[PDB]
Design a protein around this ligand. Sequence first.
Ligand code: FAD
Ligand code: FAD
Lengths: 401, 401
Amino acid sequence: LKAPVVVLGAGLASVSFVAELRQAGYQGLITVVGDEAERPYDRPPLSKDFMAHGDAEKIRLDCKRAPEVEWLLGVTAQSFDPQAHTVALSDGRTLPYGTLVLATGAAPRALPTLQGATMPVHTLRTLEDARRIQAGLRPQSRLLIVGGGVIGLELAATARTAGVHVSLVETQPRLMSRAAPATLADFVARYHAAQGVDLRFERSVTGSVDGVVLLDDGTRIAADMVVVGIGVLANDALARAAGLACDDGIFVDAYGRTTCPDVYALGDVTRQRNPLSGRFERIETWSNAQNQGIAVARHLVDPTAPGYAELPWYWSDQGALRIQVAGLASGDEEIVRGEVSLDAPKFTLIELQKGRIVGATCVNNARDFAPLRRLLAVGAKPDRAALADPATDLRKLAAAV
Amino acid sequence: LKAPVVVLGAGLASVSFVAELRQAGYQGLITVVGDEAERPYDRPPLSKDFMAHGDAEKIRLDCKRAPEVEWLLGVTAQSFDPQAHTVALSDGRTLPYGTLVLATGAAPRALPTLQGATMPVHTLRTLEDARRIQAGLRPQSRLLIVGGGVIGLELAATARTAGVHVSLVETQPRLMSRAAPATLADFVARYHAAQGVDLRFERSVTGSVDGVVLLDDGTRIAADMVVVGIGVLANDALARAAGLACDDGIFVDAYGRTTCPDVYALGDVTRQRNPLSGRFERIETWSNAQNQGIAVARHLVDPTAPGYAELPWYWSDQGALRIQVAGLASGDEEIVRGEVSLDAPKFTLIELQKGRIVGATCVNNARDFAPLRRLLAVGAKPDRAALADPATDLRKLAAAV
Ligand SMILES: Cc1cc2nc3c(=O)[nH]c(=O)nc-3n(C[C@H](O)[C@H](O)[C@H](O)COP(=O)(O)OP(=O)(O)OC[C@H]3O[C@@H](n4cnc5c(N)ncnc54)[C@H](O)[C@@H]3O)c2cc1C
Ligand SMILES: Cc1cc2nc3c(=O)[nH]c(=O)nc-3n(C[C@H](O)[C@H](O)[C@H](O)COP(=O)(O)OP(=O)(O)OC[C@H]3O[C@@H](n4cnc5c(N)ncnc54)[C@H](O)[C@@H]3O)c2cc1C
């Protein structure tokens, strides 16, 4: 940890990192460069209560555990020179650094077949994006969503609540193909279909003409607006130009180190080890942004601290479904606790590998999720009959292990 | 470049690296730790003329462009401490380093289903392995090869020449699935079948009993010896234990830097950018070991030098087939120069992407391969009719571009 510290990006990973630097006792300069001219804000509300209610002053991040930080908002870092230890800014200024931290996140992938579209086509990443989409959620209008990921489905639910007609096209045979157990994905599809979403599986967009989107089965979907949600691409251009190892994401170890000395990276922009799979992955979650930012900061201030070690998890709010997913989507065994039903949905899935818990899901059961994450963290091998048995309380099991 | 330099591994990448350090003008200490008690040697002969003729004094690497190097042969590096800048050796000694270079290569993957086998099961990586296999190539014995990669096929050809009966099992529907154009792979299968190899496609080994191997179609193959060649796994254990970013290979940038300051890696152990695909890959070739070793050394001595930038290529000698393959296996177009025939085989393939050369293959045509590699290097977009036209000479085309 060499002063001064410069962080590129002012999202959750950056805010979490600089707050932990201060809490851990670092008292040198910290400067954060953020391209959005916005008080730092959290993204999960954008497809949830913000999309529904519109008050951005409910979604700001707390920067008060980050005192004495200069936030350069509305400024783009254009390049850095890792030999000279400087960053070039879009406003003509240059920042010196002792330690540079790349926390630049990820941006929605564009859909090549809609490149020349003459109808509204949006993606959903920023506050600006959310305000633009919301301005078009007219009651009884028609929305087409491309992609059955969690964000598309949260938007689908929000739009249906607002009285908007919703169609959704997904190339895979299931929703949430990226990080959800098949049992969950099948149930979620049934839920959205029951709520009026017109779901089209194993279909891809081939183009559009005069307000109508074309599909690869030779058919058409008319819409007033298209929202593309087919995933994100790491914002790693500065790292690539400066010579760091990257591949749709900056490679980092558990200390947040890139291949360039004195340069670290954190959050959505990184490709990092998933401890459960033991493979490198670009993690795209709120908990990773916060937890990885905190761990990297802690170890910079105190090199005796462990590297980042948290296991992955996320949540998604989709209408009446409060979904929580931890760890791996599958193993060699799934245990289902409760009935899987559209009538007052409430259930838990547990994924095991050779008897060891490797993942869990809760739908409308926050109370089960915390003890399951603890059992997952220690790789618990509990009695499978008890895991299934409705009489088992998981909190005590987590306390006993 | 901080002295002293320590290199772990004494294969081609290591030898190429230390020779280039000396040629570039570095005069400080260099110590190489190699676990094999063997004068450094090249591996390609092991499935080729060595397997056939047995003289290891024809396969040694030239260490004479690497003067003043201490080679610790027969010694295993057990760990390194990147804070203390030391390496712990199996003989009880410790080496200090200013710059550590990990050049530890890769080892054959074991086949889980043959773990408890009570018949000879070998892999082919080392001189010791080659001598062991050769000692069993009895005329009229039966060899089963698991895996249709280049090394398995070179062994198949060598064994057939020696009068050994050969069967080969491949899980994919084609040979050389990893890095060869389908047109080449189809031809190579026809060649081996014509030479008496019993090829079994889309089959996998499920086990073995009393000298007989079991397949997933419920059938059996009797053999006197099995050679497993289903690929390799990076020897990255020291890097993993020391906290570097790795995933079946140590991640490096074009300067050979790992995520740990003062630690570099090169050759088969690395996962690195393929400039043609723009994706990270673990390259498994002789040319990468030599060329990456040289480039990393050059830039350590002279930081103004470019990073590693060579495009991938390899060769394979399989009986009457002298195969050379460069770049990508496929694009959006293949051009075939010559007839593809078992009668005096001689042809060239060119792979293009939007008119740009992205790969090439020569079978028994070394003269075409050099100019094609030059056209590939500059991403030439030549006239496709001329590329097909037998009247075109490629050397002049390469000289003109
Ligand atoms: C609509 C939406 C809903 C989501 N819902 C959930 C959820 O419910 N649960 C969950 O687990 N996760 C959710 N997420 C994911 C979560 O919000 C992300 O994982 C998190 O935002 C990643 O934070 P980050 O700081 O790494 O990146 P970002 O939030 O992307 O912040 C990076 C910032 O850096 C800026 N930047 C990029 N390049 C430069 C440059 N050169 N110079 C200056 N600034 C630059 C970017 O514009 C951005 O402002 C959601 C995300 C979205 C978009
Ligand atoms: C049979 C065979 C045929 C091949 N044919 C071709 C061909 O025709 N064309 C082609 O392009 N490529 C071919 N190759 C591939 C080519 O030989 C490899 O790409 C090359 O050997 C990689 O060199 P390297 O120095 O990175 O690794 P290696 O050659 O594997 O050298 C690494 C050395 O480090 C040692 N080591 C590992 N861990 C430690 C430790 N902890 N301490 C000390 N030493 C350690 C290893 O045992 C090994 O001796 C062939 C390989 C084989 C095995």
